[PDB]
């Protein structure tokens, strides 16, 4: 039943007595359900160290991964170029998922096409799909560039992208000079971030490899910036803002900020902004190239060093205080521009906020996950704040990255109770937050299920989630935030300290029980 003046959606409709009775009768009549005491017994067992030991012996099963597949990252990379359609050669189901995944995080349209390989192409290859697909996409959607990646079907059967695109031009399906950069992007290698690196290096090679003879390092007076897989609009914006405040000439290579934030003004814009083809063609003339996320830009780095002859600096992601400082000093050195008064003051405003909030942050214990560069920057800033990053999980991490994070943890006393995990998933992390409980988790929306599980053991065992990373689907407009630079560090700090104070308020809200500590001022 419903009362028209106060209509109930699923919650709380199904708590009405009639629904509750109906759902009990379903269970008892037909579901053959395990008894509640057995459910409770098994739940308890899943919180123990014994279960954790079995969980960490897995070799074949993954549960609740914290990574996605390569072509997702290739699509994100492609979206950052002017009037560019991402095109994924292979099976169309994939593109439905890539589009929906990004639609839910950004709350924006995401344009991408498939060439719809089916069982017929599985065995004779997808050449005809390429030919008709390229022609159809060009005519219908009018891109100025089509950036091609692959689904796993196309990888397994061995379709030769280069050959297929070359034949499409030879036979007239798309013009000879129409840009069709490509990259092989197998989902069974690496993760989404590897797809971004593969796509970017393919676009870079397309525009520069055959034209190197007239290039002269430093002749355009700019610094190239390669952002990597980046899903916070404020990260593209802060980098551009800081360079501009310094008077540094720059080219952001892969810039999706406009196309991921078009206005609602009565028209749909399939394309907006982006890195121009002229900027990619001219990029070897830069002073140097800076990689913002070097732990997933290794293929790109080899091309930029080997072909463009740029001496890529060894810089960590510009997250937290020390690594933002190092970024700015290196940019100053390469460009000859001094760090301006504005940025020096912004740095000191961050330091002031650290002094203001250090008493609540000190000693707080965190579990965290995400992509390698993001995770190491988060760990670095937590140590700077006097926090303990106890459980550090990077599903898509590697051995060399783990050694580097373990070295950061050694340079601080706040690293002493921390462990770094690679190859491990969110079912692994769930055990860690039961057996070695931290104060909070810092992660993406999939962490909500871990908070749910911890609460079920009891309120005193609940580990609240702080949403930083990708994807964030259950809050709105967090994709507009910043994590890089002093601005990002201010936003992160504010979020962490206010999470702590929110939880303390909840725990002290009980009248004549805990409200002696329900202070007005904190």
């Amino acid at each position: 039943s419903q009362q028209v003046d106060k209509i109930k959606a699923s919650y709380p409709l199904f708590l009405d007595q009639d629904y509750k009775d109906m759902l009990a009768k379903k269970r008892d009549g037909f579901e053959e359900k395990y008894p509640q005491d057995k459910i409770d017994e098994v739940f308890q067992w899943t919180t123990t160290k014994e279960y954790q030991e079995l969980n960490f012996q897995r070799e074949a099963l993954t549960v609740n991964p914290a990574k996605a597949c390569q072509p997702l990252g290739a699509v994100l990379c492609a979206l950052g170029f002017e009037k560019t359609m991402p095109y994924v050669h292979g099976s169309q189901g994939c593109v439905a998922y890539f589009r929906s995944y990004f639609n839910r995080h950004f709350r924006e349209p995401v344009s991408c096409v498939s060439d719809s390989m089916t069982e017929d192409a599985a065995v004779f290859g997808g050449q005809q799909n390429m030919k008709d697909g390229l022609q159809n996409c060009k005519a219908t959607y009018k891109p100025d560039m089509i950036a091609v990646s692959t689904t796993c079907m196309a990888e397994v059967i061995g379709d030769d992208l280069n050959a297929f695109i070359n034949n499409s031009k030879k036979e007239g399906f798309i013009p000879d000079e129409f840009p069709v950069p490509f990259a092989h992007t197998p989902s069974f290698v690496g993760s989404h971030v590897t797809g971004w690196d593969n796509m970017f290096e393919g676009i870079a090679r397309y525009f520069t490899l055959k034209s190197m003879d007239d290039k002269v390092v430093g002749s355009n007076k700019k610094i190239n910036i390669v952002p990597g897989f980046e899903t916070y609009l404020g990260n593209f914006r802060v980098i551009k803002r800081m360079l501009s405040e310094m008077g540094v000439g720059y080219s952001l290579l892969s810039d999706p900020e406009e196309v991921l934030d078009t206005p609602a003004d009565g028209q749909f814009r399939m394309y907006a902004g982006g890195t121009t083809q002229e900027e990619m063609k001219d990029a070897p003339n830069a002073l140097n190239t800076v990689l913002l996320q070097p732990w997933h830009l290794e293929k790109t780095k080899k091309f930029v060093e080997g072909t463009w002859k740029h001496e890529v600096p060894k810089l960590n992601i510009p997250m937290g205080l020390d690594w933002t400082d190092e970024f700015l000093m290196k940019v100053s050195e390469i460009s000859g521009q001094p760090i301006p008064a504005s940025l020096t003051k912004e740095r000191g405003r961050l330091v002031d906020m650290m002094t203001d909030s250090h008493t609540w942050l000190h000693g707080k214990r965190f579990a965290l996950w995400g992509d390698p560069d993001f995770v190491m920057g988060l760990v670095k800033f937590l140590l700077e704040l006097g926090c303990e990053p106890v459980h550090i999980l990077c599903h898509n991490g590697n051995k060399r990255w783990k050694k580097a994070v373990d070295a950061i943890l050694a340079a601080s006393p706040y690293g002493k109770n921390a462990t770094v995990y690679i190859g491990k998933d969110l079912w692994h992390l769930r055990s860690l937050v039961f057996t070695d409980k931290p104060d909070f988790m810092i992660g993406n929306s999939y962490g909500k299920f871990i908070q749910r599980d911890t609460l079920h053991k009891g309120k005193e065992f609940e580990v609240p989630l702080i949403r930083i990373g990708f994807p964030i689907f259950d809050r709105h407009h967090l994709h507009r935030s910043t994590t890089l630079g002093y601005e990002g560090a201010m936003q992160i700090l504010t979020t962490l300290v206010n999470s702590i104070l929110e939880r303390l308020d909840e725990e002290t809200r009980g009248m004549q029980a805990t409200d002696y500590n329900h202070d007005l001022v904190r």
């Binding site: 990574k67 996605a68 189901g93 998922y97 639609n103 719809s116 697909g133 959607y141 999939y446 299920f449």
Partner: protein, 477 residues
């Protein structure tokens, strides 16, 4: 808009395409005539998508794992292959259930074999057998396993059927191999059919020789309701208030035992014809169980459906049916009274998957609204045959619409509201057109039954009449 004007809009939109695509797309766009009974005279469907045109469709794995099997709550479904498919599909579809997640129910979890290069090169059958043993250790209350094949499985020659048979015997467990690789078929649709055949072959006959279930003359199954936002629970309640006993729900909030008990019922009640007609036909042929189609969107259709169902049973069920209708009458009449005056005359375009593009029309009409265009991602002609009488004369029909087509049709027709999916939502809001998600219910619902109608009306009103839609134009230009 006149029939001639709609026909001219179709030809105008088609002008953009190369010849091959033009000729094909023409066959998938039509102007409705409600007199036609054979829809193939007017439109074709269930054909391959043209490359490069931005279809909205998914794959057979979405149809099998995401739609049919994933909702079954007390089984563990393995996304078998590389990591992407299971991650993108994790908890995207709101197929609601009651359970203790990670303990006795597993629906919003993502289990995968996360294939790496070595698994591609040398095969994944050894990894699959080891994975099964890991699942048994760590999730002891699971009541069976499905293996949902992603694209590489069949391309590399793996034998998941042999693994399922050997491990299933070893562990005395139901292990179901599903060959739903996404390259198969042309859309989600073949994944439904594959999934239905897998239920038939591995689960449905398990109790064929058992006589212990105590039956009644009023036993039914709800076939093809995935419990989106609780839709199946707001349907079930009505059936049981009418005196029926709902033995099974396929597959929203569904359990493996319910599926196994379904051959014991007297009547199969089919909501989603597209996804479950196959198993319903099987059950008629093998067990002699009749099936019938129904519609619980909005009061007119729900009342008609209740009466049609009750007519299959005795006078006692018919009397209870009239009691149910009398109970809910003031409720839905109050909804109409409040919301119809706010919505009367407003025009809607729909684009959805295989059922809702026709099924929801009556509920819009119950609020005085007009559905001016409708279409489907993956329907077959038997679906179009059921649509032509539901749509008005001279309305627009579109099968596997392209992103370009849908945008251009909307620009000309200028509907007051659009009902489609997540890949369409944010496009049409930018254009200033109210949009409602008609897959996920925009995180609302249920929409089925009398309780769902209230929610549906509230939602259509909140969005269509929202103050935001008057603000897109800056007052200075």
């Amino acid at each position: 808009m006149s029939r001639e004007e709609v026909e001219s809009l179709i030809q105008e939109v088609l002008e953009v395409y190369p010849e091959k695509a033009r000729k094909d797309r023409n066959k998938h766009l039509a102007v409705n005539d409600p007199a036609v009974t054979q829809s193939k005279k007017c439109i074709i469907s269930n054909k391959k998508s043209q490359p490069g045109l931005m279809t909205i469709r998914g794959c057979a794995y979405a149809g099998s794992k995401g739609v049919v099997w994933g909702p079954i709550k007390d089984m563990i479904h393995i996304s078998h292959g590389p990591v992407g498919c299971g991650q993108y599909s994790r908890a995207g579809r709101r197929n609601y259930y009651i359970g203790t997640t990670g303990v006795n129910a597993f629906v919003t979890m993502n289990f995968t074999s996360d294939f790496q290069e070595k698994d591609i090169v040398f095969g994944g059958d050894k990894k699959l057998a080891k994975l099964i043993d890991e699942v048994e250790t760590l999730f002891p209350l699971n009541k069976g396993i499905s293996v949902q094949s992603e694209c590489p499985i069949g391309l590399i020659g793996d034998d998941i059927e042999s693994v399922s048979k050997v491990k299933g015997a070893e562990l005395s467990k139901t292990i179901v191999p599903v060959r739903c690789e996404g390259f198969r078929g042309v859309s989600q649709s073949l994944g439904h059919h594959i999934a239905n055949d897998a239920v038939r072959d591995w689960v449905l006959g398990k109790r064929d020789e058992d006589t212990t279930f105590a039956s009644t003359p009023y036993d039914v199954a709800i076939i093809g309701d995935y419990n989106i936002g609780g839709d199946a629970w707001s349907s079930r309640i009505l059936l049981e208030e009418m005196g029926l006993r709902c033995v099974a729900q396929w597959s929203g909030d569904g359990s493996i035992s319910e599926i196994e008990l379904t051959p014991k019922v007297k009547l199969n009640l089919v909501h989603c014809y597209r996804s479950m007609n196959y198993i319903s036909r099987h059950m008629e042929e093998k067990y002699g169980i009749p099936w019938m189609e129904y519609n619980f969107f909005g009061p007119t259709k729900t009342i008609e459906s209740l009466r049609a169902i009750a007519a299959k049973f005795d006078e006692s069920i018919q009397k209870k049916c009239e009691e149910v209708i009398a109970k809910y009458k003031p409720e839905w009449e109050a909804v109409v009274a409040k919301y119809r005056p706010r919505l009367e005359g407003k025009r809607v375009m729909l684009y959805i998957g295989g059922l809702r593009p026709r099924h929801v029309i009556g509920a819009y009409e119950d609020l005085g609204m007009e559905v001016v265009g409708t279409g489907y991602e993956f329907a077959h002609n038997d679906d179009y045959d059921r649509t032509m009488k539901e749509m008005g004369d001279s309305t627009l029909l579109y099968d596997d619409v392209t992103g370009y087509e849908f945008e251009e049709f909307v620009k000309r027709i200028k509907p007051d509201l659009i009902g489609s999916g997540i890949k369409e939502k944010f496009i049409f809001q930018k254009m200033g057109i109210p949009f409602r998600e008609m897959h996920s219910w925009d995180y609302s619902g249920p929409y089925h039954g009398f309780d769902g109608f209230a929610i549906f009306a509230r939602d259509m009103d909140m969005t269509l009449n929202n103050p935001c839609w008057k603000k897109l134009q800056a007052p200075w230009e």
